[PDB]
Write a protein that binds this ligand. Structure first.
Ligand code: HEM
Ligand SMILES: CSc1ccc(C(=O)O)cc1
Length: 393
């Protein structure tokens, strides 16, 4: 009944060009079985959205990766927020929701905006730059670690740690085994910068530890909640901003519309989030025998969600392969959906908006003038280098 496919969604050939295989996964049926890793797969928008909004049946406490926490021990202590189910997930979620609240973005927006308005000017003085290293990475690194309240020493560990966390959700391929092999130095620093004495007052991490008084989390739970933002608060914004620049580089008509109306910058970033989906996949584990798409999945089965394929499903989106800064992006699962929907989506949209805003007001053209190289990861889509030449407006 369920179609079986040998497609490896975690191979380098799949990362180079996932779109042909993602249509094969979508059109093969609402639910597929991937013989390479013995998992169920959903690639259409409807099933991916239904799985995300059914946390009781498709839980996350047994791991959002391939590995079953009930069968294998996790490579690191489980996330109190990402790898937990209600009700144990609720209160750590509420703390991170208030630390990254709408009232919090007001205190950092101008600093977020001025730094974006300072980087575009710096890169315009150089002309030919790398949109990944000198923009997609340089801008969030100049903004997010300080907003977290981080020290300056050892800051070159976060991006290797962030890339390793996303790589560990994948199967035991080389990408995962090579990552975890180079882990202990990155883990030691990250865990070190989760303790209360190492967080600057007023930063995100200090606010998390302040939320131990409220009784929603204990002091022993705050370092893990700080570790969640150190694992997820940087590299997805890097790939998200690096996606918008690439999309504006190959869709020059969309760049010119953004120039004429800079207020489209926020939705232009939301469109780049749907179009590229910096988080490609995430797992769930069936807590019961469940029927989905005419397929009866047993208990304790890993179900793979293709968030990028769901953001390009023609059953839900018109012209899903086109970058449209005026598209009604509401409903896309680039940030997830349900009780686990990205708690730091306001921080990511703030960084993406003010950067596309600075580009909309100061850049006239973005021309790719160098070899474009992709960055391979089991969970994250993103470019290693994007050599572009910026024309000042
Ligand atoms: C373009 C930027 C980003 C993208 C595409 C993204 C993507 C996602 C997705 C798809 C999920 C759902 C995970 C799941 O349902 O299993 C998620 C959750 C999460 N994200 Fe993000 N994220 C981004 C930025 C951020 C930022 C800036 C932060 C923190 C400052 C962050 C922290 C988290 C955390 C802690 C969770 C777990 C929420 C929960 O389990 O309830 N992410 N993210
Ligand atoms: C790649 S999305 C993500 C990664 C890690 C965490 C966490 O550390 O809790 C949350 C979201």
């Amino acid at each position: 009944t369920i179609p079986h496919l040998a497609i490896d969604p975690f191979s380098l050939d799949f990362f180079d060009d996932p779109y042909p295989d993602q249509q094969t996964l979508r059109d093969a049926g609402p639910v597929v079985y991937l013989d390479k890793w013995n998992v169920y797969g959903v690639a259409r928008y409807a099933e991916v959205h239904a799985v995300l909004n059914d946390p009781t049946t498709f839980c996350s406490s047994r791991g959002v990766g391939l590995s079953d926490f009930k069968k294998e021990k996790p490579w690191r202590p489980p996330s109190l927020i990402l790898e937990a189910d209600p009700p144990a997930h609720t209160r750590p979620r509420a703390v991170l929701s208030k630390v990254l609240s709408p009232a919090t973005m007001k205190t950092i927006r101008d600093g977020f905006a001025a730094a974006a308005d300072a980087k575009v000017d710096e890169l315009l003085q150089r002309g030919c730059i790398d949109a990944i290293a000198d923009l997609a990475e340089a801008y969030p690194l100049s903004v997010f670690p300080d907003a977290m309240g981080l020290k300056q020493e050892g800051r070159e560990h976060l991006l290797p740690y962030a890339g390793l966390v996303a790589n560990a959700f994948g199967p035991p391929n080389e990408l995962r085994q090579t990552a975890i092999e180079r882990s202990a130095p990155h883990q030691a620093y990250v865990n070190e910068q989760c303790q209360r004495p190492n967080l600057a007052p007023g930063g995100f991490g200090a606010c998390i530890h302040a939320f131990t008084d409220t009784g929603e989390i204990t002091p022993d739970e705050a370092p893990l909640l700080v570790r969640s933002l150190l694992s997820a608060g940087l590299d997805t914004t890097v790939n998200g901003i690096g996606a918008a620049v690439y999309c504006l580089a190959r869709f020059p008509g969309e760049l010119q519309r953004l120039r004429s109306d800079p207020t489209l910058a926020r939705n232009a970033f939301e469109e780049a989030v749907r179009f590229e989906s910096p988080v490609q996949t995430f797992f769930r584990t069936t807590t019961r025998e469940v029927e989905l798409g005419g397929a009866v999945i047993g208990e304790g089965e890993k179900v793979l969600m293709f968030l990028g394929s769901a953001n390009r499903d023609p059953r839900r989106w018109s012209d899903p392969d086109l970058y449209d800064i005026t598209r009604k992006t509401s409903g896309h699962v680039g940030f997830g959906s349900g009780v686990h929907m990205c708690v730091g989506q306001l921080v990511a949209r703030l960084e993406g908006e003010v950067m596309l805003s600075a580009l909309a007001r100061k850049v006239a053209a973005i021309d790719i003038d160098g070899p474009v190289k992709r960055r391979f990861n089991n969970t994250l889509r993103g470019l290693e280098s994007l050599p572009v030449k910026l024309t000042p407006a």
